[PDB]
Design an enzyme around this catalytic site. Structure first.
Site, PDB file in Angstrom:
ATOM      1  N   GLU A 111       0.864  -1.170   0.000  1.00 49.70           N
ATOM      2  CA  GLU A 111       0.000   0.000   0.000  1.00 49.70           C
ATOM      3  C   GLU A 111       0.904   1.224   0.000  1.00 49.70           C
ATOM      4  OE1 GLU A 111      -3.913   1.204  -0.526  1.00 49.70           O
ATOM      5  OE2 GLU A 111      -3.179  -0.838  -0.261  1.00 49.70           O
ATOM      6  N   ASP A 139      -5.046  11.663   7.877  1.00 51.93           N
ATOM      7  CA  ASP A 139      -3.835  11.018   8.355  1.00 51.93           C
ATOM      8  C   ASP A 139      -3.344  11.654   9.649  1.00 51.93           C
ATOM      9  OD1 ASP A 139      -2.902   8.852   6.500  1.00 51.93           O
ATOM     10  OD2 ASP A 139      -3.212  10.507   5.063  1.00 51.93           O
ATOM     11  N   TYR A 197     -10.875  -2.537   3.385  1.00 49.96           N
ATOM     12  CA  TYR A 197      -9.998  -1.917   4.379  1.00 49.96           C
ATOM     13  C   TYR A 197     -10.768  -1.804   5.694  1.00 49.96           C
ATOM     14  CZ  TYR A 197      -5.990   0.892   5.937  1.00 49.96           C
ATOM     15  OH  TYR A 197      -4.886   1.353   6.604  1.00 49.96           O
TER      16      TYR A 197
END
Ligand SMILES: [Cl-]
Ligand SMILES: [Cs+]
EC number: 4.2.1.20
Lengths: 256, 394
Positions: free
Chosen positions: A49, A60, A175
């Site tokens: 990834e 993030d 995910y």
């Protein structure tokens, strides 16, 4: 190419889970990044990834925010990332490669053009961090037209309608972010979702074993790898050896 | 999916990580029911009247238009508690947070005005308030940081990225993704993911509603044009909203031109940026050719938002509203003129709007026209900046 199906088919006959490191492309330099990725594969990563540095990665935490800053300092651009992706794919024909993108880099030169370019360099999947399933239609349609798997995050606060959208719209893998865990995996295979990779706070070999035993097909180490790079910025050779020891230890843990 | 349309034509949307979608859906539902709730409307109107100072005056300029056929009025949001129009919408959002059972407020701020406004609304209503600020902006606005701390707000500096407003907008979102059970994200302008462009407009729209009633009372007719500066778009859309259907009324938004559009150092994304996707919306923005997000530049810190509300991009595209730009120097001149001739010190932000009204008047001095400028704030906060520039020049 269906690299993910092939990966999972072999992993399942060998009753293994997948171990998937995340790393930012070009961190801390283009040449050192290319060597970090070759180390991660050789030490036993089943897939990759990869992040493209973006100015405003609002989904993030700090470890990835700093990874982007290091890469921007090295002059890394989206175009240079795509050059790097072609090289990696030339060296490693079978490993699945997934991109973690922010929507503006996908939108910038045309959504369809972005996915065309992914297909050209041999990318297997694209997760767009800031596109929810409700807004995904132009993205996943472009992805499917270019034989790219669109990856969706299934968050802890997911309800049932979300599970059904994630199960119908996603390909390659699901995910998983951390409702009981075991129940999430079961609803997802109930709805025939792509195999679920657990991706929340996977730091130690014991967590990799737990994810597989809990029914997930594997685990993504979303920042523990970037921490090793941050720790060892001054010593590149200690950086690669620590990465080699960590990845092989995590990958050994997936052998249940 | 949602109760209201998240898009204005092609602009807007909800471009957030999946994990934040329940928070936006909860917020949209609470807003729709608050809007149908007479008890909420009366509490809101009570706070605006008895705490913030509404309705604000509509001042006819006496001296500034001498020798022309322009009549100029100023909507005096500079007389609002806090000294800027921001106070209107933070009171509404704080009442919404309480309605949702939330007890904490998150906010981002650049110049500090939204952080002050969120801190005072939080102190009044009993909410614990934490404020994210780019460490570049902390250093340069230590007056506003002291104000926030005096009002009990926790200020948290952001060194991520360029450590300005945009990077504060990101860390507030990260916080809210984990804390939305108990915390409300008090966004500062009429941008971001739906439903915020709609909410901030509805909680600013009294500016236009009052202006219309006040101008009909004084002049017996609607203005030829209303003019407002555009950083994120909240004061402009609040002025515009009630005139949108009065198609004889010009709507003019003014973006900061900085040192000049041609210099590249400006903050005019609507007319000189490029559509992209960031901060939860599809809208015109300041970006590089690679798709990285740049900063705006303007002499006025309050027009620092590198994008624009999506309803403005929509209104421009269909031709309902016109958007122009005004340079640092044009704004400074307007600042000086309002001081000397009307005895009002305007915010450097608002001075961009006034500078365009002065341009319309001066270029065509025999044109009869009735103009309203939205004076979005007072300029006490800008006197040090203006002083230094005028010393550096002579
Ligand atoms: Cl009053
Ligand atoms: Cs702007």
């Amino acid at each position: 190419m269906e690299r993910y199906e092939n990966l999972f088919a072999q992993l399942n006959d060998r009753r293994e889970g997948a171990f998937v490191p995340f790393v930012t492309l070009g961190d801390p330099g283009i040449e050192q990044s290319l060597k970090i990725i070759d180390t991660l594969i050789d030490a036993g990563a089943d897939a990759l990834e990869l992040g493209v540095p973006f100015s405003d990665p609002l989904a993030d935490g700090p470890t990835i925010q700093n990874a982007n800053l290091r890469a921007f300092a090295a002059g890394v651009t989206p175009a240079q990332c795509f050059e790097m992706l072609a090289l990696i794919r030339e060296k490693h024909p079978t490993i699945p490669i997934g991109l973690l993108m922010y929507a503006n880099l996908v939108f910038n030169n045309g959504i369809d053009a972005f996915y065309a370019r992914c297909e050209q360099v041999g990318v297997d999947s694209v997760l767009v961090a800031d596109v929810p399933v409700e807004e995904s239609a132009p993205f996943r349609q472009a992805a499917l037209r270019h034989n790219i798997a669109p990856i969706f995050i299934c968050p802890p606060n997911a309800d049932d309608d979300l599970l059904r959208q994630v199960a119908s719209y996603g390909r390659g893998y699901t995910y998983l972010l951390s409702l009981p865990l075991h129940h999430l995996i079961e609803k997802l295979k109930e709805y025939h979702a792509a195999p679920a990779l657990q991706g929340f706070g996977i730091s130690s070999p014991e967590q990799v074993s737990a994810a597989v035993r809990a029914g997930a097909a594997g685990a993504i180490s979303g920042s523990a790898i970037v921490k090793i790079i941050e720790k060892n910025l001054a010593s590149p050779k200690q950086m690669l050896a620590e990465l080699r020891s960590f990845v092989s230890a995590m990958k050994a843990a997936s052998r249940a | 999916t949602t109760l209201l349309n998240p898009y204005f034509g092609e602009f807007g949307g909800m471009y957030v990580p999946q994990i934040l979608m329940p928070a936006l859906n909860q917020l949209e539902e609470a807003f729709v029911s608050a809007q149908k709730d007479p008890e909420f409307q009366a509490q809101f109107a009570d706070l605006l009247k008895n705490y913030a100072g509404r309705p604000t005056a509509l001042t006819k300029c006496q001296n500034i238009t001498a020798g022309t056929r322009t009549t100029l009025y100023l909507k005096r949001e500079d007389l609002l508690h806090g000294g800027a129009h921001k106070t209107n919408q933070v009171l509404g959002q704080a009442l919404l947070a309480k309605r949702m059972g939330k007890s904490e407020i998150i906010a981002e701020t650049g110049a500090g005005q939204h952080g002050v406004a969120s801190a005072l609304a939080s102190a009044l209503l009993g909410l614990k308030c934490r404020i994210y600020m780019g460490a570049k902006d902390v250093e340069r606005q230590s007056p506003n940081v002291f104000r926030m701390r005096l009002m009990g707000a926790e200020v948290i500096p952001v060194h991520s990225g360029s450590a300005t407003l945009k990077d504060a907008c990101n860390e507030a979102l990260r916080d809210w993704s984990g804390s939305y059970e108990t915390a409300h994200y008090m966004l500062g302008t009429a941008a971001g993911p739906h439903p915020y462009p709609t909410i901030v407009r509805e909680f600013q729209r009294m500016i236009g509603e009052e202006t219309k009633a006040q101008i009909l009372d004084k002049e017996g007719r609607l203005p030829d044009a209303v003019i407002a500066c555009v950083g994120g778009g909240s004061n402009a859309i609040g002025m515009f909203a009630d005139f949108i259907n009065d198609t004889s009324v010009g709507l003019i938004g003014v973006e900061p031109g900085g040192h000049g559009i041609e210099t590249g150092e400006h903050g005019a994304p609507l007319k000189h940026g490029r559509v992209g996707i960031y901060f939860g919306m599809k809208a015109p923005m300041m970006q590089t050719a690679d798709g990285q997000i740049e900063e705006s530049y303007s002499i006025s810190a309050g027009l620092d938002f590198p994008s624009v509300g999506p309803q403005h991009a929509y209104l421009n595209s269909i031709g309902r509203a016109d958007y122009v730009s005004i340079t640092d120097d044009e704004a400074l001149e307007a600042f000086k003129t309002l001081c000397r001739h009307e005895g009002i010190i305007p915010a450097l932000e608002s001075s961009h709007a006034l500078a365009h009204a002065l341009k319309m008047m001066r270029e065509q001095p025999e044109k009869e026209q009735l103009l309203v400028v939205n004076l979005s704030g007072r300029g006490d906060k800008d006197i040090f900046t203006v002083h230094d520039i005028l010393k550096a020049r002579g």
